[PDB]
Structures are given as C-alpha cells and as structure tokens.
Enzyme design. Sequence first.
Site, mmCIF file in Angstrom:
data_model
loop_
_atom_site.group_PDB
_atom_site.id
_atom_site.type_symbol
_atom_site.label_atom_id
_atom_site.label_comp_id
_atom_site.label_asym_id
_atom_site.label_seq_id
_atom_site.Cartn_x
_atom_site.Cartn_y
_atom_site.Cartn_z
ATOM 1 N N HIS A 1 23.618 69.520 43.277
ATOM 2 C CA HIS A 1 24.307 70.104 42.223
ATOM 3 C C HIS A 1 24.254 69.669 40.713
ATOM 4 C CE1 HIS A 1 27.634 72.823 41.983
ATOM 5 N NE2 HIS A 1 28.431 71.861 41.196
ATOM 6 N N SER B 1 28.435 75.168 36.815
ATOM 7 C CA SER B 1 29.951 75.044 37.879
ATOM 8 C C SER B 1 30.408 75.730 38.360
ATOM 9 C CB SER B 1 30.116 73.587 38.660
ATOM 10 O OG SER B 1 30.507 73.655 40.189
#
EC number: 4.1.2.10
Lengths: 260, 258
Positions: free
Chosen positions: A236, A81
Amino acid sequence: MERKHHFVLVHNACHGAWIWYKLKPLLESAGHRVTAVELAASGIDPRPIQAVETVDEYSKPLIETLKSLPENEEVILVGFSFGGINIALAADIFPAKIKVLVFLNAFLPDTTHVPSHVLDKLMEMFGGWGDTEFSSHETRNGTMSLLKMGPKFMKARLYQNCPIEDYELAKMLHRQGSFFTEDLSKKEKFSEEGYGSVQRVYVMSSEDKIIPCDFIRWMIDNFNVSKVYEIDGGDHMVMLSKPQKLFDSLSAIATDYMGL
Amino acid sequence: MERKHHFVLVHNACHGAWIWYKLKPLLESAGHRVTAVELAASGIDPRPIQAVETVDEYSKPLIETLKSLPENEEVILVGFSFGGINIALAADIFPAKIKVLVFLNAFLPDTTHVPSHVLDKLMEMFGGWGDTEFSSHETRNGTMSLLKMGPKFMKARLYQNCPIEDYELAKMLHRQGSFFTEDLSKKEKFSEEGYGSVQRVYVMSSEDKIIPCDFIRWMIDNFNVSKVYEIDGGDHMVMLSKPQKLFDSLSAIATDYM
Ligand SMILES: *N#CC(*)(*)(*)([O])C1(*)(*)=C(*)[C@@](*)(*)=[C@@](*)(*)C(*)=C1*
Ligand SMILES: O=Cc1ccccc1
Ligand SMILES: O=Cc1ccccc1
Ligand SMILES: O=Cc1ccccc1
Ligand SMILES: [C-]#N
C-alpha cells in the site's frame, strides 16, 4: 530538455507529508517541482483530528495550495488512498489548475452516488482491521468516526514490503485520523462540470493489501479513467516500498501530459 | 548470548522520536529493547511549544518513561544535543534506573554552575544562524526564547553528511522549539548525589558543525566522563548520517556495562 511539471502530493489518512520523503527528491532531481501538502490534523499539523470535523476543513491545506498558485499554472495532482477523495474535492473547485489527477492506491469516487460510496463499499468488504482502534467523537452535527491504526495491522496490511526503518518511522509518526464517512454521506455529489471534466489516471500497486484488485476494477467500472499503471511488488505504502518505480510511473504520466 | 540492554533514546530540540528511525531497528535486530521518547511539543506531540513553558514540562515524557520501568530495571540513557540536558535532569531524579548516560553530540552540564552554563557558553561563541527564525514568548515565568530552524541552516549545519531523503524528511517534521535557557539559568544546579553519581560516556561526531571539538574538550574538562568515543565522519545528525557507526559505538558502550 522536455518541459517539467509541478507535482502536488496528497497523503493518506493517519499519516502526513512525511510519507513523501523518498519520492520528493527523486522528482526534484529530474527537474520537477514538488509540493507535499500537509492536511489538517495530519503529520505535524497542530490540530487534533477531533477539531477537524468535516472533510472540507481536513482538505483545506490542499485547497489553499492550489489557490495560491500563480494564474494559469496547472499541476499534476497525486492523491494517495483517502487522498483520492481529497483530490476529487479539489478538482471540483479548481478544475482548470489540474492537468491530471493521479489516483495512487486510492479511492476513486464517481459523480453518480453520494461522496462516501466507495468508502462505504470498502468498509463492508474489508476484514482484518487487526489491532486498529476505532472510536467516535460527537460533534454538534453528528457522530464522527475516528481510527488509529495498530502496529500489527500496519506491518501486515500497509508496510509488509517496506524497509523496516520505514515501518519504524511510521510507528513514530502515524496519528489518529478519520475517513469522514458521515460528513461525506451528507455532502453534495461530485460534479461532472468540475471533477468529472478533469483528466484522470490510476496507479495501483501489485501487493496492496488494503486496496485490492477487485475493488479497483469495481471503482474504475463505476467511473472510468484514461489509463491504469501497475507498480510491480509495491505494498500500500508504495512511496516507501518502491519509490523508484513510483517515480517511473509519475514520469510516464508527465510524458503523456507533456507541456506545449 | 551476552546480556542485552534497554536503550532509552532522547532526541534534540526542534526534532522528535522520529530521528531514531534508523538506529532503533539496528539495536533491536541485535536483541536490545529500545524506547524512543517523544518529548513535549516535539514530533507529533499535540502541544505547541508555547504551551510547554518550563524544561521540566518539556522533559516530562522522559521522567514518566523512567518512572514506569519495573523495579531494579536499569537503562542505557542516550541524550542527543539538548537531550543531554534532559538526561541530566532525569538522572537527578532516577539515578538508580540508569546504568550509564550517553552524551551523544550533546550538552554535558556540570554540578557547579547553573544548569544553562554550557549552553550560554556555546551561544556566545556560535555564529551563523542562517535563516533560523528566533521569537519570544511571554509567560508567567518570564520570557521564553523560541527558535525554528531555517532549511539552509539545517542543510549546512546539521544535515550536511545526511542522505538527501533525510534532509527532506526533516524539513517535513522539524518544529519550532526552545533551549529553555532562561528557565535553566534560574534552576537549582544539578546535584553530585543524583546526576553526578551516575556513570557517563561521551560520543562525538568528527564533522559536527554545531558542536565544535574544542567546545566538547572544554565541557569534558569541566566535568569528566568515563570514556569518550568518536564517530568518524558523522555530522550533528549522526543517527541519520552514520547510523551503523552509532550502533557500533552504542554496542561498545553496552559491552562495557554488561
Ligand atoms: N538540540 C539541539 C541541536 O540539535 C539543534 C537544534 C536546533 C537547531 C540547531 C541545533
Ligand atoms: O492509507 C491507508 C489506511 C488504511 C487504514 C487505516 C488508515 C489508513
Ligand atoms: O482501508 C481503508 C479503508 C477506508 C475506508 C473504509 C475501509 C477501509
Ligand atoms: O546555545 C547555543 C546553542 C547552539 C546550538 C544548539 C543549542 C544551543
Ligand atoms: C487510507 N487513507
């Protein structure tokens, strides 16, 4: 036995080293070494995010981990990320300690535009912050934008395929954080000589409700990679929802960058 | 449906709210409410232990949690290890907000000796701190003994029946802390009217290598509980090694205080 590797794992904003608690022992039972870095004001680090004003200060534990490696050791550096930006910062400093950068559901910056470019893009396009709480803190050099995820947002957008125990764990540990977008907008471009020279791959999760397919394509089109892997069914937080498959991708990556 | 309860869960020294990450959803899936308190300088609390100089400042997040409950609400108050001490302090302040105190592999203080009594006793006989780092911090209250577990000690003594992932998780989260023995040595004894009036049960784990069985019998002997439950095969971190069974025991407790 094939030669094993040193993986350095870099977490996302608002989280810490702890996300890696499933992946770390898998890699290590395969004989790899793992260092799970804890970035500034992250995890159990003692500073609040207000005290870490720049992305360099934030990334400093990663830089120190690379600096302290014995001479000529190289690593597989995995950035998750916003960890993408961290690993690019580091690759611009220590390019020859990095065998390959693994952009894991990550921001993949280029050498052409300002360092914030992929973040500003995602910020314009993202819609559904939910209960996330934004605020800002004035520093002597400019406003710093901060954020603290809300739990509905967490469940829906990051953790929707994770075991409930992992969702609960994250709600006890997540912290206020920053993407450092003002600091990154003022910073010198990432270099071709440093970052640009390092080998890089991208690992994407098929059900990432943060970093969508279109936005990845887009980033890859701005700044190509050696190879793209997809983790089937990952959210995610793929190191929590699908740690076994994440293991499988990182072992494939190790096999392509095989030692000697 | 049986009436469900509110469990307030209080972690051990050097750890934090996170230890409850398996037990909390088990309890919530069964319809109960759960509050996992994060004590001072614990888990992601932003204070270092050096800034939390008394056991009362350490315990403050628990007291504030009890204080903010609506009127007549009562909780099942569960204290793990040094969390016993915390919950006893809490009972002496808000006894009427606690249906029952659950001592989970916990220190069980009495109302006749100084609050540190049961810790001084274990400390004398305990050996094999392994790679644990002890240090001292001077305060306006005199010297404070700090400790940070070493990873070999943790593996062998706390986490030996835990999944490896739990052990790794803890290595990433455990922090320097304190048993506040000096402060507890100097503190007013826990009271009969507060703490002593509250119902208490003990829950022990059969493979706890921190709290020996003999030590437990000695504690209960100094200070009786209504009932004692045992978790077969649990290490000291029973919430991580045997969450389901801990859930089973806590359901049984809830069934009795209906
Ligand atoms: N409190 C408590 C115990 O769980 C403990 C804490 C640190 C080291 C050993 C035991
Ligand atoms: O790791 C992803 C993320 C997304 C939004 C807020 C904080 C972190
Ligand atoms: O979703 C993560 C993120 C990061 C920067 C800007 C917008 C979103
Ligand atoms: O006082 C000794 C001791 C030992 C283990 C945990 C807490 C206290
Ligand atoms: C997102 N870090």
